[PDB]
Design a binder for this molecule. Structure first.
Ligand SMILES: Nc1ncnc2c1ncn2[C@@H]1O[C@H](COP(=O)(O)OP(=O)(O)NP(=O)(O)O)[C@@H](O)[C@H]1O
Ligand SMILES: Nc1ncnc2c1ncn2[C@@H]1O[C@H](COP(=O)(O)OP(=O)(O)NP(=O)(O)O)[C@@H](O)[C@H]1O
Ligand SMILES: [Mg+2]
Ligand SMILES: [Mg+2]
Lengths: 341, 341
DNA sequence: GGCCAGATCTGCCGCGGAT
DNA sequence: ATCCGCGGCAGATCTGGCC
């Protein structure tokens, strides 16, 4: 796509009226507590994204109605997106008519690279496994249905199994029915995902990076549930299934959650986001818009040049931070208002 | 006190043999993956602290012998500490004779400021309570004993309650004593930790900081237990007690886990660590050594000027980062070795 | 060698936002 | 009105430290 115009009314501490991004790479500079995060967050929400914060904290102090408006231009045709926050919830108007948030799933959208994306690379097992589930669900709508259906059957089987025992064969059949499909989809996705991550991180650094998926029921879910009946009966839980897998990111053959430093995990997080951005371009046909917050804070001079040189080949990108990249147009944010010369 | 010497043998990527820090304020400059965090972590461990990492990941790749040696000088007299990490575990020598690790708890020690101290401010409900508990436990052992006793008594009471009902009145009285002592000690500590925090944060920024503790059994544990009898019986869990408190950090009157930016959160975390350092120095008699990692990574010029101006008045402190503070001695780390001008 | 502290992990229940 | 995805809380297994 190509963003044309952004307009807001009483969104967080913002005090602007209109913002027109230029084509190609851009920049934003400022001091602490000025509103770079607020502006990027508003641009992300205007195109149909998600935010960690609740909708009651996204309105100005003492008001009840926020309004965001953005205009985009694609080959298909021009669009106008209207958002209206408040107490009842969101209200989206695509081109002038009320419509649900789900219909925007087909549009390219945007990609937001933020500091909290770094806590999945070096986080606990649950968080690492949860990161992959919501990434595959962005490309296939069938994966989410299977993932939601498997959980109900697992819970019912475990609840029955806590009560001594019964003819629980049917729940075993259902669990085996869903787990095999889930595992096959995961393998199929990672087979495509690994080479792009390998060849993207090789342009920002030197060492190689990879993935390893440790499976528990790889040969068969039912043939693994039959092989652990005594221990499962004694313990009272289902100990085998896709809900117990492991994902680890490797740096030169070592786990990244125990050996990697901070400026070395930041590059892995950015490479993961950039590899996701590339695949969505082939899936949709038009690459999304890239938004990066604090692009070069925790990195040294060698890495910053590589990031800045990679980011300049994209159709459109916006970087924000305390310092101005050299050679690119620069805006400024002062107490919520954006002004450019 | 003072730190006079530091020597190692096969501790992570470090390859130095001796390192002598000058009195006053020092610095360390390096690129990514050079050994700044490793050096600070080694000093912190050698002086008698605790490290988040595991003891099997702290040894050089391919060996099972780690050695840490440090020489200090207290007002009473000089000391000498040595460490040895291997398969059996940690081993500590004090002037040539073995001693348990609990003995070093009386010595002043050190204070470490790290990026994962920022998760307490912006973290969930339980993490802030855990931070408060482990902060209070560094000034008294009665708190630890009461915590353990109360936890065990509550676990037994819940186990009994989940299976029908019995003479619970014998179990309400034992829990009430520990709960009352715990809440009294918490109030006593927070009545003194707040003015110091406000005064310290008033020198690094402009806004105001505060603390708020919300209690479910302020009037009395027995009264609340009697009041919530029907709910406890129906749900099956004790819904009232010191294990259900809130700690909220306020910036100009609003909670910091929602209405706050990155720089303000960093300043809050640093102010909390400095307040703990000052209180601990008052408690023992000699302020502990201060170690700061990436002091000024995500701050503007004014905030890090203020931080440097404050740190210039300490008996001994060491700062590390990608850049140097103007006007202080510096040392450079390359490939794991340290060379001073 | 043995057993108590104590932080880490996994499944269950109730709550908040969309269709 | 109802399913969906989620934050908060309690419980059990593990490894390492002290007697
Ligand atoms: N809903 C809101 N209404 C009004 N002010 C708000 C709101 N949310 C946040 N703020 C204020 O906005 C400021 C921080 O905004 P923010 O967008 O994070 O700045 P920033 O560009 O991110 N600075 P930085 O710390 O470098 O990231 C603070 O003064 C907050 O109190
Ligand atoms: N057990 C180990 N044995 C040998 N090398 C190790 C070990 N653990 C980590 N390393 C190396 O140490 C590097 C990072 O060291 P580190 O001390 O974090 O540097 P740093 O000063 O923190 N650089 P920065 O990324 O800015 O924090 C890793 O990239 C590894 O190459
Ligand atoms: Mg921000
Ligand atoms: Mg580091």
């Amino acid at each position: 796509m190509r963003l044309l115009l952004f307009r807001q009314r009483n969104f967080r501490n913002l005090a602007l009226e209109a913002y027109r991004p230029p084509p190609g790479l851009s920049a934003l500079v400022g001091a602490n507590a000025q509103g770079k995060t607020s502006l990027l967050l508003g641009i992300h929400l205007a195109l149909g994204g998600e935010v960690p914060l609740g909708l009651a904290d996204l309105v100005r102090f003492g008001e009840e109605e926020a309004w965001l408006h953005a205009e985009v231009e694609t080959e298909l045709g021009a669009y106008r997106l209207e958002h209206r926050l408040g107490p009842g919830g969101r209200e989206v108007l695509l081109n002038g008519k009320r419509v649900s948030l789900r219909t925007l799933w087909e549009l390219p959208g945007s990609v937001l690279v933020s500091p909290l994306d770094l806590e999945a690379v070096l986080g606990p097992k649950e968080e690492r496994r949860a990161y992959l589930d919501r990434l595959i669900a962005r490309f296939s709508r069938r994966y989410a249905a299977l993932l939601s259906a498997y959980e109900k059957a697992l819970r019912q089987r475990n609840a029955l199994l806590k009560a001594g025992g019964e003819g629980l064969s049917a729940w075993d059949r259902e669990l085996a029915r869903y787990g095999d499909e889930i595992v096959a989809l995961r393998r199929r996705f990672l087979r495509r995902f690994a080479p792009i991550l390998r060849e993207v991180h090789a342009a920002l650094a030197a060492k190689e990076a990879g993935l390893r998926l440790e499976e528990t029921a790889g040969e068969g879910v039912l043939r693994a549930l039959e092989a652990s009946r005594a221990e499962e009966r004694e313990r009272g839980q289902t100990l085998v299934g896709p809900h117990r897998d492991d994902l680890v990111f490797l740096l030169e053959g070592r786990p990244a959650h125990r050996f990697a430093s901070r400026g070395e995990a930041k590059t892995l997080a950015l490479a993961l986001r950039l590899a996701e951005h590339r695949l969505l371009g082939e899936h949709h046909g038009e690459p999304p818009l890239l938004l990066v917050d604090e692009w070069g804070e925790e990195l040294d001079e060698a890495r910053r040049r590589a990031v800045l040189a990679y980011a300049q080949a994209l159709p459109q990108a916006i970087l924000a931070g305390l310092e101005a990249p050299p050679g690119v147009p620069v805006c400024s944010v002062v107490r919520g208002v954006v002004l450019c010369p």
